[PDB]
UniProtKB/Swiss-Prot annotation, chain A:
Disulfide bonds: none annotated. The lineage of its organism: Eukaryota, Metazoa, Chordata, Craniata, Vertebrata. It is found in: Mitochondrion inner membrane. Belongs to the peptidase M16 family. UQCRC1/QCR1 subfamily. The gene is UQCRC1. The chain holds residues 214 to 302 of 480 of the full protein. The modification N6-acetyllysine is found at K35. This is Cytochrome b-c1 complex subunit 1, mitochondrial.
From Swiss-Prot, chain B:
This is Cytochrome b-c1 complex subunit 8. The gene is UQCRQ. It comes from the Eukaryota. Signal peptide: none annotated. GO terms for biological process: cerebellar Purkinje cell layer development; hippocampus development; hypothalamus development; midbrain development; mitochondrial electron transport, ubiquinol to cytochrome c; pons development; pyramidal neuron development; subthalamus development. Component of the ubiquinol-cytochrome c oxidoreductase, a multisubunit transmembrane complex that is part of the mitochondrial electron transport chain which drives oxidative phosphorylation.
Amino acid sequence: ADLTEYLSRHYKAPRMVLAAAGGLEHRQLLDLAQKHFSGLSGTYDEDAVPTLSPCRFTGSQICHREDGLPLAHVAIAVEGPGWAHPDNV
Amino acid sequence: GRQFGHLTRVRHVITYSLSPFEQRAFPHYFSKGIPNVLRRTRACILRVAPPFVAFYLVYTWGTQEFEKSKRKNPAAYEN
């Protein structure tokens, strides 16, 4: 039930993209999308709540000390801007 | 001397920590500190305090005897 609810909650048309690349033609893919995919948001929710809240970044450290391991792994990072920001280039 | 990297062997302990710019430097300074000092005080009074009152008592007595014995004195020489 936890799964079916997560599915219903999320595998909804407007958050899905059917993508393809190769020796195809757009119309064939569109036709197929209409043939095999029509009937997903024949519903579409009233007050559901699919919104994403921003995530607080914290200047912090986590150290898992294990002298039994032969080499150290270390990963440092500062807060990035996000997919949309042109600063990414 | 000794260097970080060659001190001793430690296995299995995780340390979580925050950036100073992310936390308070005095959180519950009074709320938690006062209680804490009361508690460290209780924990040590019985060992620290007694020898000192013992000196204190000998301090006041000692000077008391000194004054009454020599100066104040000239007690009786009656004729």
